């Protein structure tokens, strides 16, 4: 039942910095199934209680790999949030996976 002023004055401290891709749904503390090497992801300023990534992030995906779930990480090597990307994909060969944006939101 938080208010926008609150909502915003909360996610400002979150600051996720790293994103890791996973083949299957993450566990309570996802440590296995890490398919891609971690990469930096620059987030943005809270506004209306939701923060979204600002840079189109490109991640190398190894051959014969599938990507369906992601886990954001902070600077303390502690997984913050977990979810699933809209469209999974199989990379039969060496390729690059692109994420247009990820939006941590609290409006629902």
């Amino acid at each position: 039942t938080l208010t926008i002023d609150g909502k915003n004055k909360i996610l400002a401290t979150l600051t996720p910095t790293t994103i890791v891709l996973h083949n299957v749904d993450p566990t309570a503390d996802p440590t296995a199934n890490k398919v891609t090497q971690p990469v930096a992801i620059f987030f943005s300023e809270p506004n209306n209680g939701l923060i979204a990534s600002e840079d189109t992030v490109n991640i190398t995906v190894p051959a014969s790999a599938t990507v369906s779930h992601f886990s954001l990480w902070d600077d303390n090597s502690k997984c913050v949030a977990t979810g699933a990307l809209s469209s999974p994909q199989f990379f039969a060969e060496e390729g690059i996976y692109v994420i247009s944006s990820v939006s941590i939101d609290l409006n629902k």
């Binding site: 189109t56 699933a84 692109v98 994420i99 247009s100 990820v102 939006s103 941590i104 629902k108």
Partner: protein, 46 residues
């Protein structure tokens, strides 16, 4: 909390240029006569 993400397109930028060269080769020598027709001895008269 949603945590729901999105997905984009693979956009890449590269600058490509192909180049070539040129060289001019010439072979000449001082004229010492020349291939003539009917090479015969002659007796000029004025």
């Amino acid at each position: 909390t949603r945590v729901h993400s999105y997905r984009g397109v693979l956009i890449i930028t590269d600058e490509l240029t192909v180049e070539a060269g040129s060289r001019v080769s010439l072979s000449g020598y001082v004229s010492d006569g020349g291939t003539s027709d009917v090479f015969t001895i002659c007796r000029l008269l004025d």
